[PDB]
Every structure is written in C-alpha cells, then in structure tokens.
Symmetry: D2
C-alpha cells in the first residue's frame, strides 16, 4: 500500500482576514469596505466608483453588499486598481468584472500575474491561486488614471511582486486636502532574496522601493494588510489613530528586510 | 462573534485517482501513464511523443517520470491533446508546457476554459480549478493533427463540457491495425439539464454526442475515467478485458442521462 | 538585383463601406449608426446602450459621434455584440472598449478569432486583420443577454466563420412588437468548401445554418452587409422597403452556395 | 460628395529591410539569417536552436529557408527571444511558433505588446501592427535562459519600448571566447519625450538604459537595425569591420536623444 499523490491544499487564512465589516470612512470620498484585516478601498465619484483591491476570492459578495450600502450599484463600479496580484488582494477581481462591468487597469507585470490567476508565482509556485482575470488598460510608472475628476497616480514599487504598485490620490476632509497613499506590501514572506534565479535583481528592487515609498505624497498611509501601517479597522473612528507615516512604514520594512537578508546568509528563514 | 466568510475549499478526489502506476501498454505505440483511476495516454512516435490528458495538477512529475521510463525525455513531448478541460484531466497542462516545450491543440471551447483554469465553469463555478494554460493551435471538428506520421482526428462531442472531444488514431498490435477511440465523458454530474441559462441547448448537444460516440471508428475504447468504459488499469495485462464498445458506452451513458433527466423533472438530483 | 520580399498589403475596401451616415432609425430603440454599406446597430435602453458590430477599424470615431447624436455618451455603452470577428465588422472593437468601458460578449469561436485580431483566419490567413480584443463574457447557443430589460438571444450559425452568430431581440414600432433578426453573413468568399483541412465540416455547418436562419423569429431582417438583405441605408426612410425575409435570405444564400460548390467541383472559383 | 473615411495604410519599409540574404556567420554558433537591414540571429546548439528576433511578418519563410541551410529543421527551433515587440522585429513570431513549435520567452512588457500584435503602441497607436503571439515564459531582469548549454542573459533597457531587452551570451571563435551583446534600439522615432502621459518616466528610463548598454559584457555588439551599430551585412566577411563598441553605441544614442530633447523643447521634431 504505497502513498498516493497528495491532495490539493486550499489557501487558508486567518479568520480576521475573512471577517466582514461595515464601510469605514477614510476621507470624504474614500471608504474601507473589505474585511477587518484586508483592505479594499472604494472611492466614490460623481461619475462612478473605483475599487482599489478586493481581498480574497470569497469577498466578492460582501464587497458588492458594502457598495450597495454606499449607494453604488454594481454597474456603477467603473474601475478596479490593484496593489499586487496575490490571491488575498486580487482574489475576487474576475467575479467583480463579470458582475459589474468594471475595467481593470494595471501594469504589465500585474496584468501577466493576474491572467495566470497567481499561478507560477516567482516564490509561491502554484500554492496560492485565484480565478484569472484580464487587465483592460496597461499603465506605466507615474501614469494618471482619472474617474469622475479624481486622479489616481501609479508609483511602481517592485519587490513583493514585480508589479507591486502604490496608488496616490487627493481626497478631502473638513475642507482640507488629504493626500492618500495606498502603498503596497514591502514584505518578502519566505522569499529567497539572494541569487534568486527567478528574480535576480530582487534586492535592488526592494531597496529602490523603500525609497519610492519614502517619497510618496502622503498625509494618510494605508496598506493592503492594514496592520503593516498600524491601522485597526475594527475600532471604527479610532482605526487610523496609530497609522504610520510613509517614512516610518518604509523604515520598518527595510529593517525587517535587512534582518531577513542577514538570516538568509546565516542559513535560516 | 459573527461567522467569518468560509475558507477556500480544495478540490479533493478519491485516493485511487491519485495513485501512481507504471506505464501500461495499450497498443504498439500507446501507453497509459497516469494513475490507477485517471487516464493519461502517451503515444510515442519516431519524431516525438503526444500526451492525451494529464490528469490532476499534482500528476505532472509522475507523468514526466513515466515518460522517462518509456524513453521520452521532457523535450521529446511535442503535443498535448485533451478530452475536456476540467481539473482532473487538464490539471497539469500549464506545468507540462513549461517543463517540456510541448504545444497544446484544442478546440475553441476547450481553449477558453483552459485559459480560465477551469474557473467560471458552466456548472461548477469556481469550485474546481487549476493553473491556466494557453492553447497554441485551435482545431475544428474532424481536423487531423499529425505527429511522427501518426494522425489524430478530433470528433467534437459537446455536453459534459462545451469543448468535449473524442480523439481517434490507428495504432497496431500483432501486425494488425487497432483503431483506438479515446472518447470523452458523457456524464452530467450535478448538472441542471433543462432550461439551463448558461447552456440552453445542453440536452440537444448530449443527444447528438451519444450518436457521435456510437459512430466512432473503434476497435478499442478508452475514456478519461477508465471505469466509464470498464477498464481496470490496476490489473495490468487484463486491464482491457472488460472494456465496453463505443456502442455500449454510449448506450449506458444515454440511459443514465435519460434517468437523470426524469429525476430532474421529478425534482431530485 | 533580386526581388525583395513583398511589402505588407493593407485591407482596402469599397468607398461606400467607409462612407459615414447619420443615425437611421430601425425601430423605437434600434438605430443603424455605421456607414452606408456596413451595419453597426445601436440599441438604446434606459440603463445604457448595446452596439451590435462596429464595422471597419477606422470607424471608431464615427460610431462615437453617432452615439453622441443619439444621446449616448461613451461611458453609456455597456455591451458590444458581434455577428462575426472579421475586420470589416469587429474592426474597431478594441478601440471602442478602451474609449467606453463596454464589455464584449461572444461565443468561444468568436472570442478566439477576436483575440487574434483576425490573424490565422481559416481562409484568409493573415491578409485581413485588425487590433485584437478580448471577450469579457462567453455565450452559448441560445443564451440570452439582457441590458436595460431588452433581451438579446444568440443563435449560432457557423460557416462564414466558425463563430458566426445571429442576434434576435424584440423592439417596438407604432405600439406593436417588431421581432428584429440581425443574421450573420452566409457567404463563402473565395473559400475552399470541400475537404478543407482547416474546416472539415464546413459544408455541413453551412447547410445547418441556412436552416437556422429560416427558423429565426423575424419581422425585420438586417445583415452585416446591408445589401445581403436588400437594405439601402443611403435612402433614409425607404432603406428597409426591399428588405428580404429570413426565408428569402437563406434561400438566396443556399442557391449561391450550391452553385459555388458545383463550380469548385468543376475546378473554378 | 463628401470624403469617406481613409483606407487602412500598410506598414511599408525600405526595400533593404526586406532584401533576403544567405546566412552570415557571426561566431562559431551564431548566424545572421534575416535580411540585409534587419537582424535575425540564429544560435545553434547540440540540443536545438534559438532565434533572436525575426524581422518583418513577411520574413517567416525566408527564416525557415535559412534555418534549413544551417541544418536546422523547423522542429529543431526551441526558443524565440526578442529585442522589442515592434512589427519589424517580432513580425513573424506568431507564424514561426505555429510552424516550429518553438516557445517564446520575454519580459512582461514585451509579452503584453506581443499579445496585442503591436496595437495600442504608446507612440504609434495602431499604425504598426503584426499578428499577435503569446509568450510562453516570462523573464525577469538578469534572468538566464539556457538551451543546449548556451546561457542567454536578459538585460532590461526600457525606452524604445517599455520591454526593450539586450541579450548577452558567450560564443567562441578561433578557440577564444566572444562575448556577444545583442543590444536593443535606443532610438525614439517621432516620440514625445517630455511629459508623455502614456510614458511619464520615459526620459529617466532612456538615461538608465544608456548606462545599462555601456555596462554590457561586450566583445562584439549587434543591434536589431544593423546600421545602428555600424554593421553592413551585405559585405559578407567584412560585415563586422566597422562595428561600434557598446560604449560608442550608447554615446551616439545619448547624443542623438539629448539633441532631440532640446529640439522638442524648441518646438520641433
Ligand atoms: C481567461 C480570461 C481572463 S484572463 C477570461 O476569463 N476570459 C477570456 C475570454 C472571455 C473570458 C471568459 O473565458 O469567461
Ligand atoms: C500573506 C501572503 C500573501 S501577501 C501569503 O499568502 N503568504 C505568505 C507566505 C506564505 C503565504 C501564506 O499565507 O500561506
Ligand atoms: C496566462 C497564460 C496562460 S493562459 C500564461 O501562463 N502566460 C501568458 C504569457 C506567459 C505565460 C506566463 O504568464 O507565464
Ligand atoms: C468528476 C467531476 C469532473 S469530470 C468532478 O470534479 N465533479 C463531479 C461533480 C462535482 C465534482 C467533484 O468531484 O467534486
Ligand atoms: C491583447 C489584449 C486583448 S486580446 C489586450 O489588449 N490587453 C490584455 C491586457 C491589457 C490589454 C492591453 O494590452 O492593452
Ligand atoms: C468581405 C469579406 C469579409 S466579410 C472580405 O474581407 N473578403 C472577401 C474575400 C476577400 C476579402 C476582401 O475583401 O479582400
Ligand atoms: C491570440 C493568441 C496569441 S496572443 C493565439 O494565437 N492563440 C490563443 C489560443 C490559440 C491561438 C490561436 O487562436 O490560434
Ligand atoms: C523603425 C521604427 C520601428 S523600430 C518604425 O517603424 N517607425 C519609426 C517611426 C515611424 C515608423 C515607421 O517606419 O513608419
Ligand atoms: Zn502578497
Ligand atoms: Zn497579502
Ligand atoms: Zn469533467
Ligand atoms: Zn473527470
Ligand atoms: Zn466576414
Ligand atoms: Zn464583411
Ligand atoms: Zn522599434
Ligand atoms: Zn525597428
């Protein structure tokens, strides 16, 4: 009686990443509409809405529910933007496109990973996947995408994925501008950093990306994993109280990266 | 403490579907190289090999091992053909393409489902998925694909999937021709047959496909699930003893389909 | 001084195919907005517009101009449907998608040809091409697509292309229903009909498609080339006067097909 | 009698770009097999051949002819690499893939442009297009691709296109190593350089790419347009005599770029 091949293993996550929350207002037009521990930002304009990230694949219905609470019908969603195309951020994109008619704008690296459904990941292989989706517009570094007069600027910050992107826009609160920076992850979870044949310039890209994050226009920083920027979505009006600056987020990420690099030289993860 | 969204659920299968077996010769050039309960046929020519189906995603390494036992190095695999693009038959195609340089030939319906990784299935939704892969050649009904002088003919038999295909070729044994028919599944597992908005002509297609299977050139029938044609790969040289004819396979499938249709009218699965 | 390789040759067409016209009303909601000799139908609903075909690639701006004359802003175009994915009918689809955010719904055969930009055509090779575009929804035979409460039904009629489709919907005029049938081309221009290795069942498909066209619900027939159904868009309110029935269109196409088949047997085009 | 829309215009080129030539040996394994004025490099190994660029779409048959003269049958072509995905360098890729079974390896930017057939170009729009093709392997900056033991290293040099790549490998001649650098174009033909909304960091990318080219391992430089590196393929064994170094090629390109930038500030092309 010899061993059969192993069964496929599902991508399972902490319960808080799947815990629905009601819409939490970030600025006049901008709302967190994902789960307690995964960001999905809805930006509402007079000419339709923009969604930045959707979380896990199973979050599609919840996102549509929260859009409805905000007055956004499915067909009112015009545009989906992404931080990076891993299953816990781009998971429901294919379903959202089918149910809303929204288009996706992303850089070429994010587009190719999204079209693979996250398979053949440089570090994860086929372990963390989701339904594939197509990008409808390819964007370049620094390119501006505008919906309802609100301009979103892309800032490439490769490392966590080759296509990792920060998005910036200026909202308002109390009559004053609020420069929002939605910066992507700077983690390298389980990654081989040095001499990686699938990503030879990984270290150089991360190092440049720390600098890119430090330089973002940033009155208020948000991140795909809210804990990375010290947000606590579950506490409502105090959710943003402890939020990091872009400088502090980059500094923390670089210290962690440097320590991980030294541990890899020392033979451990 | 309210319920979080459910975790993703992996596509799990009976252990026998994942139980490796050594190559089992079907005819002079044709070998079963999959698992005990999933067909993957290797056809070896003087100018490279053809693979018809690969089974589950986790079978890629085993298939390459069996190819090596047959004298087929990875780069010797020229062509992948498919019965249908469900995860338990097309599962390892993307990985095989990357590791062998083989091309995929398939009809348009199979190509679109394969490129989705089986997501947005007409009946399964996103429940049964696999790494997406691209077809390199689109084939039409009755089209002949030739490798090393061996001609493979496609016979469309829509129903189980819109792109379901039977493949026929003539091998030899004991100096005599053996017309092999690799006919696709004719099951409708859990499908809504009547008035299905995603497949309005489902019943008409199945009915035509029973006739197509009856008419195949067929000295020896094989099926993606070997039990459907009464093969038992685990018993070696007796594996083919009880194999059905194409007529008998079509008849059994049609009786099951008609009974399921009546049960659906009677309100049950 | 030996001959260089030939220059690329552009797909050039009769001037009337490129001659802009103002919107011509077909029924209460339905307008011809293409050129004098290429159909592009705009169907306007309370929840956005549908475009059936766009003509040649250079027609994108003209279509948007005519949409504006009808009160349809670019973002109001929700859906693009196609008769078949040749350059003179799907030509501007990629550009329209980028400028409107519309989605494309098409069958798998049309989707694969559209994604090739018409290249590797079964009969034309690479001679007649256009910017590639992706389908966003794959439709099956008989499937209903609804926008603003108006239901469009797909009727597959393979032959002219494998993915050739007739679209039907019911509009109104003078308080009475008008069953509109937009039937695809039934021509085989320069095609090898018999024993075509790239389309082995071509004759069988055309023969079935003549029957499909005869059976369409049809108070008013329109065709991608208006002359094929005896429309004359240039004469305004008399444009539809001489229009054929579906029965007469199918009969004329079948007689032409049978004559061409006999000429092919007799060695001529 | 008002003007019809303009006819489509073919991409026409100088006759020398389409003038076939016999294979010209560059090093022990490496041959120029394109036309007098467009590079297409064949690298022949014990385990199959690599093609770097193919020229214009109409060059497919000529390339296959020259491969045959070199002893390379169609199925012996294993891999296609590209400098950049414009019609005059990637033109015949789709056809070559269909006729050889070769795979394409390219970066994400090149993959997305190739899959568009060069349409929606950042600078050319839809004016310069070719049959779309899919990449089979996505490569990263500095990644090594190996065929028959010969290692090809990718060096990203964005500017002329976002995906512009230099490829390096070490061949031999007279028992000594020859480090070959196939560097992409550094021209900006008709491009808006400053404040280009579709390429906001164009100038920064070109400036970094001049430095990348200067730093390439380079005993012998070749370029997609041979005149850019002072090759003259038509003079046979003297073809390489006047070839530039990488330093000189970068310097000439940067001086031209700086002059064009000043002219753009001065309001001219
Ligand atoms: C695989 C692609 C996304 S990358 C997809 O979902 N498509 C491509 C064509 C239509 C639609 C579908 O199959 O439903
Ligand atoms: C959180 C990341 C995605 S940003 C992830 O999925 N990881 C991190 C490494 C492994 C894998 C997992 O959770 O299983
Ligand atoms: C999503 C497609 C298959 S349908 C894919 O895997 N591609 C497309 C381009 C290259 C390669 C890859 O991303 O590795
Ligand atoms: C055997 C089929 C594929 S041919 C399958 O995966 N089924 C049948 C219906 C449900 C699902 C499952 O096993 O979970
Ligand atoms: C080639 C595809 C259509 S079949 C395309 O245009 N795409 C695919 C991703 C984004 C967009 C683009 O490149 O502009
Ligand atoms: C009218 C058809 C498309 S429906 C066409 O483009 N043809 C017909 C055959 C040749 C080619 C041409 O006009 O050059
Ligand atoms: C459009 C793609 C290349 S990007 C293509 O040619 N395909 C995709 C599937 C098969 C093959 C074909 O249609 O011939
Ligand atoms: C030589 C370049 C491609 S590298 C080209 O095609 N150009 C340069 C600008 C215009 C266009 C043309 O020849 O028409
Ligand atoms: Zn991630
Ligand atoms: Zn994550
Ligand atoms: Zn199945
Ligand atoms: Zn199965
Ligand atoms: Zn046509
Ligand atoms: Zn036409
Ligand atoms: Zn170029
Ligand atoms: Zn060029």
């Amino acid at each position: 009686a010899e061993a059969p091949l192993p069964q496929l293993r599902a991508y399972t996550v902490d319960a808080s990443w799947l815990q629905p929350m009601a819409p939490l207002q970030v600025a006049d037009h901008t709302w967190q509409i994902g789960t307690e521990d995964l960001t999905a930002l809805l930006v509402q304009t007079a000419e339709g809405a923009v969604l930045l990230d959707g979380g896990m694949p199973q979050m599609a219905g919840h996102l549509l529910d929260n859009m409805k609470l905000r007055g956004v019908a499915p067909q009112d969603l015009r545009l989906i933007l992404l931080s990076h195309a891993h299953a816990d951020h781009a998971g429901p994109v294919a379903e959202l496109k089918r149910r809303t008619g929204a288009h996706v704008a992303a850089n070429a690296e994010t587009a190719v990973l999204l079209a693979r459904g996250g398979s053949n990941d440089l570090h994860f292989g086929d372990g963390i996947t989701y339904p594939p989706a197509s990008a409808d517009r390819i964007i370049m570094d620094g390119e501006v995408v505008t919906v309802g007069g609100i301009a979103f600027t892309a800032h490439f910050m490769p490392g966590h994925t080759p296509g990792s992107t920060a998005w910036t826009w200026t909202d308002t609160r109390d009559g004053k501008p609020v420069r929002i920076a939605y910066a992507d992850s700077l983690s390298a979870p389980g990654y081989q950093l040095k001499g990686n044949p699938r990503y030879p310039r990984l270290i150089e890209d991360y190092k440049r990306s720390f600098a890119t994050v430090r330089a973002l226009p940033c009155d208020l920083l948000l991140t795909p994993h809210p804990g990375a920027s010290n947000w606590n979505y579950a506490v409502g009006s105090k959710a943003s109280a402890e939020a990091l600056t872009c400088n502090a987020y980059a500094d923390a990420a670089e210290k962690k990266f440097d320590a991980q690099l030294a541990r890899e030289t020392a033979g451990t993860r």
